[PDB]
Amino acid sequence: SSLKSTFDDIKKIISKQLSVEEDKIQMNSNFTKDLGADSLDLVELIMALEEKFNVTISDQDALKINTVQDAIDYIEKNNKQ
Amino acid sequence: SSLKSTFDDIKKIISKQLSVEEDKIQMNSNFTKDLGADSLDLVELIMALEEKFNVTISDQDALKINTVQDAIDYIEKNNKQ
Ligand SMILES: *OP(=O)(O)OCC(C)(C)[C@@H](O)C(=O)NCCC(=O)NCCS
Ligand SMILES: *OP(=O)(O)OCC(C)(C)[C@@H](O)C(=O)NCCC(=O)NCCS
Fold this sequence. Notes:
Two copies of one chain form a homodimer.
Chain A: H1 3-18, H2 39-52, H3 59-62, H4 68-77
The complex binds 4'-phosphopantetheine (2 copies).
Residues 38-39, 42-43, 46, 59, 62-63 of chain B line the site of one 4'-phosphopantetheine (PNS).
Family (chains A, B): Belongs to the acyl carrier protein (ACP) family.
Organism (chains A, B): Plasmodium falciparum (malaria parasite P. falciparum)
Protein name (chains A, B): Acyl carrier protein
């Protein structure tokens, strides 16, 4: 998919799973440091992304997802084998 | 402690637990993204820091330790109650 639609939905998801304001979400926003996600929020987020984009984010790959950009970069790469 | 001695030892530890070159470690180095630490390397690192500086890094606080600077900033803050 073109990034625009992809970023639109991720933003909508992140704002739904963490209950922060949609417009306070930016490419460089850190999930744990800037958005205040805890252990359980992360699990819920990674799974929300896994269902919307129908991907699988292995625990190895989740270690490298710190920012929204990381989320987008991964989704775009590991959706097409 | 003054940061210099603290940074000296952390560098020595990170280089020991991850087997990367000491000089390739910088303040902004990401543990999982730049240094290639896996799940088990992280556990071993957090515990190595916990024994050298005799602190306790709760799982809540470990979520916010992405870079070497984060490691240093935390150690310096949460060592003096
Ligand atoms: O909050 P907590 O320490 O109980 O749990 C944190 C972890 C990283 C174990 C969970 O959030 C978890 O396993 N989530 C699924 C995979 C990740 O989110 N991994 C991110 C590692 S920073
Ligand atoms: O590599 P893995 O998914 O099996 O485990 C990753 C976690 C984050 C569960 C461990 O590295 C772990 O719990 N380590 C102790 C606390 C942390 O390192 N937390 C960092 C969260 S990114």
